[PDB]
């Protein structure tokens, strides 16, 4: 950090070291994953912090410890169904591999008869959307704050050969230093060529991908544009009731912004909402340089970020360990295991 | 304004992920 403020450019090297010793770290746990660290009776089920199609996510307490955890349950069958089989196994192998101060941590995993079970790190603060939502919008120096963490995340995960094709306010939780937390890896995929699944969410979808024609991790950077954008105004660039309306808008290319734009804000989203891949930035030869060099990010002292060292526009209310205040109710179902081992061959490596 | 009209949207609360 020192030297990058000093003599820009000068942290290339040290920069490129510390992604190689991340690659090493991360290739080791990937080609053995850590398995079966923990069991179901370990842990107080308390409360339900969200749910999905084929599983939800609750707030435990670990029995031993006293600490308090996010468990991700997933229903084995329901994957199955959803033929989603491979998507689970790609976001346990990727998530007990990667390390990076804005990824939620993976603490422990194991399966059951039923069900397969993601033990991560606790993060109070609640999602993105839920502030952003009641608040309306953030200024620019707070989006850009935001903004500055995904940037890094990114540069980090692409290193790593991995796409990450789920980023929305939903998927980023705020830390009790008021620094995001990127969750839900059910998307991730390893992958050095293009790839082809229609996966993400409708609003954040690259039109290349709407159109079926094959991507690479260009789709995580248009997402990112997306983000900035909804942070900034308040609402997304394409949006519509249904699906469809939204598919349309987005391969149109045409955008609006609102009037309170700064013009470098404009300019950097025009760059990430670019349909054309020849000219998007992030997937140019000079890569995620050309976002880290934006007039919009001349402010951004990128190391600082990385460090925590940098003020966080706003800390979340923190009421005791457990407090689920930052999240929605949802409704409650017994977590039922069965006396049958479902799917066993499907998911052996889980 | 484009802000009520988002907020008129059937499209304001948690948006599921979506794959086939
Ligand atoms: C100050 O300039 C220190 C010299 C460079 C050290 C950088 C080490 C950390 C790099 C963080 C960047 C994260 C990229 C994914």
Not at chain 1, 65 to 83: R, T
Not at chain 1, 184 to 195: L, S
Not at chain 1, 283 to 301: E, P, Q, R
Request: proline content about 4%.
């Amino acid at each position: 950090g020192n030297a990058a403020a000093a003599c820009k450019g000068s942290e290339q090297e040290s920069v490129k070291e510390f992604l190689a010793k991340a690659k090493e770290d991360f290739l080791k746990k990937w080609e053995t994953p850590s398995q079966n660290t923990a069991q179901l009776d370990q842990f107080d089920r308390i409360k339900t912090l969200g749910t999905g199609s084929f599983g939800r996510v609750m707030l435990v307490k670990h029995k031993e410890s006293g600490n308090h955890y996010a468990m991700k349950i997933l229903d084995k069958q329901k994957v199955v169904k959803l033929k989603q089989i491979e998507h689970t196994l790609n976001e346990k192998r990727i998530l007990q591999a990667v390390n990076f101060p804005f990824l939620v941590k993976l603490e422990f995993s194991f399966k059951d008869n039923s069900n397969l079970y993601m033990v991560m790190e606790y993060v109070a603060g609640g999602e993105m959307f839920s502030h952003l939502r009641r608040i309306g919008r953030f200024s620019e120096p707070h989006a850009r704050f935001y903004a500055a963490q995904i940037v890094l995340t990114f540069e980090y995960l692409h290193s790593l050969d991995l796409i990450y094709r789920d980023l929305k306010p939903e998927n980023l939780l705020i830390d009790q230093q008021g620094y995001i937390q990127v969750t839900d890896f059910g998307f991730a995929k390893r992958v050095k060529g293009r790839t082809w699944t229609l996966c993400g969410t409708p609003e954040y979808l690259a039109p290349e991908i709407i159109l079926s024609k094959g991507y690479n991790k260009a789709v995580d950077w248009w997402a990112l544009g997306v983000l900035i954008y909804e942070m900034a105004a308040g609402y997304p660039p394409f949006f519509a009731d249904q699906p469809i309306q939204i598919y349309e808008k987005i391969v149109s290319g045409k955008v609006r912004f609102p009037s309170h734009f700064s013009s470098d804000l404009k300019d950097l989203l025009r760059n990430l909402l670019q349909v054309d891949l020849t000219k998007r930035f992030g997937n140019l030869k000079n890569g995620v340089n050309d976002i880290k060099n934006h007039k919009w990010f001349a402010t951004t002292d990128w190391i600082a970020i990385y460090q925590r060292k940098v003020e966080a526009p706003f800390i979340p209310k923190f009421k005791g360990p457990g407090d689920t205040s930052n999240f929605d109710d949802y409704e409650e179902e017994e977590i039922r295991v069965s006396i049958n081992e479902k799917c066993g061959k499907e998911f052996t490596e889980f | 304004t484009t802000y009520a009209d988002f907020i008129a949207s059937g499209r304001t609360g948690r948006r599921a992920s979506i794959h086939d």
